């Protein structure tokens, strides 16, 4: 059984001022739309999710600070009622059923279809309020986030089922998108009422500081959430467990190893993004400040959340983070999937 001490993270806090009102009106979003069983809603009214969104959104809009809280409730709302601890998590056919209909929930409240449900329900006051505070383009580019989302929670289904672990690589590539991190992204442009031009958005070494940023959160958590995760009794996959399979660690090795590649990642994500905002424009300079608030909000959040402090079983946790890595070195990953990031450097 592990310590996780203090990780390596150079931006500094921040949250908006309502986060308080927020995580009341979440909570009471979560009631009113029925997200959840009883037992499920009842955990996750307490687990300060809109003060999450406080400290992704610092300085956004509060009406789409409200929005992505809202949305990340939902988000857990599916990935712990079927994905984690349902039973279409274990039935990856079912699941990707389920999950195209939700999309064209998304695309379309109006569509006579799932009516019924709770989740469905929920899905179209979200995009009503995409629609209020967002383009047609980030619309769309929220849709299709969803879709990478969704795609890769089949993925990860499909071991639940077979109790299999994947390597590192398709770990990684899974992990990239099945933590729900692509979806957040359009909500940030709209938090500050500008919109990303796709020449922008889409280019590949902006697309790979944003994959970075998912990268660094998902392992975040990987390391946080462990504790919570590894004492369930359900099946679990996280970094920790992919490395102890691939290199033959224990799980404090496993810990320090995790550790090595968010460092490294963490290093890397600053000095691109230092780069692409010395000639970006100010919507992509604008961009680059919400995903370090973005990793920096799921940084303090992962530490004080009762999610992952889990109070009847208290996790042991640090109570800061530290300005320096462990890991100082501009070693590539070894991993195929994103180890062509370092290319980005000159
Ligand atoms: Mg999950
Ligand atoms: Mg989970
Ligand atoms: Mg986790």
Known sequence: ???????????????????????????????????????????????????????????????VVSLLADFILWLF????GHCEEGELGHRPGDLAGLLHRLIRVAQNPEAPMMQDDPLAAGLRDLRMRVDRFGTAGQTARWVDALREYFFSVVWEAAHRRAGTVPDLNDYTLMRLYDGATSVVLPMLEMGHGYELQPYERDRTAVRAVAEMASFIITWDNDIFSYHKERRGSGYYLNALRVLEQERGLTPAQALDAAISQRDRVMCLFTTVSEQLAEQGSPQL????????????????????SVRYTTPDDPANMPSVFTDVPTDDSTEPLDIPAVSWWWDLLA
Do not use: M, N
């Not at 037992?39 to 400290?55: H, N, P, Y």
């Not at 709302?77 to 712990?80: K, L």
């Open 1 to 63: 059984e592990l310590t996780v001490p203090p990780l390596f993270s150079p931006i500094r806090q921040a949250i908006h001022p309502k986060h308080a009102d927020i995580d009341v009106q979440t909570a009471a979003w979560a009631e009113t739309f029925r997200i959840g069983s009883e037992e499920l809603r009842g955990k996750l009214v307490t687990q300060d999710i809109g003060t999450f969104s406080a400290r992704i959104l610092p300085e956004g809009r509060e009406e």
């Open 285 to 304: 300079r604008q961009y680059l400040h919400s995903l370090r608030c973005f990793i920096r909000g799921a940084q303090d959040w992962g530490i004080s």
């Open 77 to 80: 709302g599916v990935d712990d």
